[PDB]
Amino acid sequence: SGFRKMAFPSGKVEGCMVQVTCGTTTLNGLWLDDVVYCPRHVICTSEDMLNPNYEDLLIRKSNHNFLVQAGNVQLRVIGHSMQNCVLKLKVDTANPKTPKYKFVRIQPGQTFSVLACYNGSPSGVYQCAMRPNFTIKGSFLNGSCGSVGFNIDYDCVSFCYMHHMELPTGVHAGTDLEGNFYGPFVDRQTAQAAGTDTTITVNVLAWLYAAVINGDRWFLNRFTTTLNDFNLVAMKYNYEPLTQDHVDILGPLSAQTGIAVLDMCASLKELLQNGMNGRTILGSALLEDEFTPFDVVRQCS
Amino acid sequence: SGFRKMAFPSGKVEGCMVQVTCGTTTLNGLWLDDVVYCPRHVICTSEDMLNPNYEDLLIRKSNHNFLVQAGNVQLRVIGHSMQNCVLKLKVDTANPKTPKYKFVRIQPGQTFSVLACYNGSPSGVYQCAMRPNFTIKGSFLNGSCGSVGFNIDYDCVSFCYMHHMELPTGVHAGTDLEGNFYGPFVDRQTAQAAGTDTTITVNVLAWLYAAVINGDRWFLNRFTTTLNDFNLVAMKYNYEPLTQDHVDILGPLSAQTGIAVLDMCASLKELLQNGMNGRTILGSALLEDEFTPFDVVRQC
Numbered sequence: 001s002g003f004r005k006m007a008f009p010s011g012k013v014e015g016c017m018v019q020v021t022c023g024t025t026t027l028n029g030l031w032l033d034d035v036v037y038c039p040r041h042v043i044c045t046s047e048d049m050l051n052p053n054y055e056d057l058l059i060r061k062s063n064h065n066f067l068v069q070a071g072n073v074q075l076r077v078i079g080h081s082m083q084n085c086v087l088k089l090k091v092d093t094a095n096p097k098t099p100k101y102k103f104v105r106i107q108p109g110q111t112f113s114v115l116a117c118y119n120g121s122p123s124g125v126y127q128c129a130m131r132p133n134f135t136i137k138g139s140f141l142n143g144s145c146g147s148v149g150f151n152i153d154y155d156c157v158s159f160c161y162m163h164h165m166e167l168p169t170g171v172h173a174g175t176d177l178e179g180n181f182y183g184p185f186v187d188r189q190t191a192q193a194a195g196t197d198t199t200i201t202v203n204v205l206a207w208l209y210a211a212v213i214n215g216d217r218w219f220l221n222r223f224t225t226t227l228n229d230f231n232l233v234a235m236k237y238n239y240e241p242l243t244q245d246h247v248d249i250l251g252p253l254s255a256q257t258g259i260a261v262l263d264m265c266a267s268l269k270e271l272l273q274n275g276m277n278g279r280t281i282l283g284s285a286l287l288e289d290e291f292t293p294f295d296v297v298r299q300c301s
Numbered sequence: 302s303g304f305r306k307m308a309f310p311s312g313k314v315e316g317c318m319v320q321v322t323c324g325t326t327t328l329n330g331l332w333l334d335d336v337v338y339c340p341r342h343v344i345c346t347s348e349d350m351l352n353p354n355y356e357d358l359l360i361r362k363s364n365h366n367f368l369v370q371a372g373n374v375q376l377r378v379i380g381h382s383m384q385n386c387v388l389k390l391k392v393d394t395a396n397p398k399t400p401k402y403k404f405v406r407i408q409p410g411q412t413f414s415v416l417a418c419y420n421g422s423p424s425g426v427y428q429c430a431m432r433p434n435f436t437i438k439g440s441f442l443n444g445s446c447g448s449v450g451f452n453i454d455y456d457c458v459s460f461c462y463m464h465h466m467e468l469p470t471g472v473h474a475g476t477d478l479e480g481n482f483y484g485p486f487v488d489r490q491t492a493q494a495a496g497t498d499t500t501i502t503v504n505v506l507a508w509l510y511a512a513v514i515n516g517d518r519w520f521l522n523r524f525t526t527t528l529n530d531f532n533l534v535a536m537k538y539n540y541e542p543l544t545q546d547h548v549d550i551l552g553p554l555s556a557q558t559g560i561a562v563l564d565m566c567a568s569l570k571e572l573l574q575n576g577m578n579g580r581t582i583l584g585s586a587l588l589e590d591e592f593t594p595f596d597v598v599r600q601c
């Protein structure tokens with residue numbers, strides 16, 4: 001037993017991380033088959049970042065403008081192109097450590113592991129949720145751009161995130177591996193803020209199931225409720241709506257414990273109104289919303 | 302910016318994890334050079350659970366009784382010995398993925414990454430601290446025995462923990478990689494219980510220094526405290542005593558933020574008295590004790 005925020009083992013991804021330098025900018029690239037993926041903003045001087053014309057800055061560049069280092073080995077760049085906000089540097093050598101992989105775009109509420117990197121060197125791994133406002137609450141310092149997020153399904157790595165920027169509130173924004181931003185953000189030095197975040201209702205309920213499974217039971221009660229009734233409480237507390245699709249996804253946990261979702265929604269309703277009456281749940285004084293149902297089932301079964 | 306419980310990249314440890322089977326018992330082993338390390342309790346049966354005589358049970362085993370398996374490959378055991386509570390299976394192949402490594406015994410308050418593994422396959426990675434009662438608050442299911450805890454400072458892997466057992470309170474106990482238990486625990490299923498646990502005071506102060514570095518100041522106050530007055534208050538909330546050593550270790554974080562250690566001690570005395578009044582520090586509504594002074598500097 002026990003319940004902890006747990007990342008996927010990162011080794012399949014550690015083997016894909018390289019250093020990418022263009023002029024004075026060094027950051028992280030992802031080396032899969034014979035291509036290195038990194039943020040297109042590596043080609044930008046500080047001056048360029050204010051109003052960059054990427055079309056024009058890039059036709060001005062050539063293969064030899066990009067230094068790509070896998071540990072202590074220079075890769076030769078033999079091609080360059082841009083897809084949305086991601087730069088593709090074709091190299092002379094296919095990565096012998098390329099795992100089985102897909103590029104995937106995740107949905108708000110879904111979780112993934114981040115491998116934080118600096119000068120193409122893996123440095124830490126931690127679990128994030130894609131927030132409803134399309135930010136993630138990461139831990140990133142200068143040089144962390146190009147760090148990637150992923151899931152693992154059997155032997156397949158699904159890459160879902162590349163880190164581009166930090167917003168003024170301390171939260172992080174990036175793209176999928178096809179260079180499409182998550183959220184209404186642009187890769188320019190301009191004024192950008194995260195929308196007001198919302199609480200991921202289905203993940204809080206998953207976490208209450210994990211708490212029960214680990215013998216934290218105090219917050220439970222004899223009552224039940226309806227979507228309509230709960231959702232009017234949810235809207236009031238800045239909670240995402242609970243859909244019928246969410247109730248079905250919590251199916252397994254509802255069975256495995258004897259508490260039905262609207263039975264658990266009754267408990268959560270009470271915690272929102274009345275608070276935790278000075279207790280913790282799984283060593284937290286907050287309602288944790290960065291564990292999905294799958295995360296709980298994975299870790300608890 | 303941001304502040305997260307951050308584990309080390311697990312790849313260097315993934316390449317060492319194998320499955321060990323003895324009788325009906327399967328658990329994880331650690332394959333370094335020509336040796337597989339695993340808990341010696343893999344050689345116990347149902348009636349060996351209470352008062353196993355390990356020296357008696359091991360002399361009755363031959364190399365071929367131990368089925369070691371790295372992915373598909375069966376590894377052939379050519380030698381076995383016990384060191385304390387750890388079994389060492391010598392094998393005919395050296396692990397080609399063996400990283401630079403060392404074995405280190407850590408003190409209470411120290412943190413490490415855990416690679417949780419089932420049937421020799423790594424499942425997930427997370428951070429833990431050695432609690433002052435010599436347990437860890439982990440996430441471990443049946444089969445996780447032989448999972449290890451480690452740090453990776455400067456490309457050298459320091460192994461500090463191997464998982465042996467879960468105690469009745471749902472907390473976890475194991476050994477260093479020389480097989481000596483952390484705490485007064487033994488590898489028998491005779492009734493055991495952890496000492497009352499305490500909060501790791503030096504780590505809470507480091508985490509308050511992290512919050513200030515990330516631009517939180519709301520909990521500072523105009524007060525100071527003597528070290529002795531701090532300890533007399535903090536022990537009334539089940540906090541560990543803060544020693545001069547702990548004060549010395551925070552000197553760098555003090556210097557970087559310009560808040561004296563005993564000034565920060567007055568902030569913590571106040572937070573214990575007041576709670577947080579609907580506020581949070583670095584995303585938490587509790588005081589966090591599983592980041593060391595070194596972890597704060599590494600991450601910030």
Ligand SMILES: CCOC(=O)N1Cc2ccncc2C1
Nearest residue numbers: 140141142143164165166302
């Ligand atoms: C006060 C210093 O902050 C920075 O310059 N950055 C760069 C940067 C880029 C991406 N994520 C986070 C960061 C932190």
Ligand SMILES: CCOC(=O)N1Cc2ccncc2C1
Nearest residue numbers: 001441442443446465466467
């Ligand atoms: C079926 C055994 O009961 C459990 O749920 N355990 C075993 C066990 C053994 C070692 N560490 C953790 C655990 C969790």
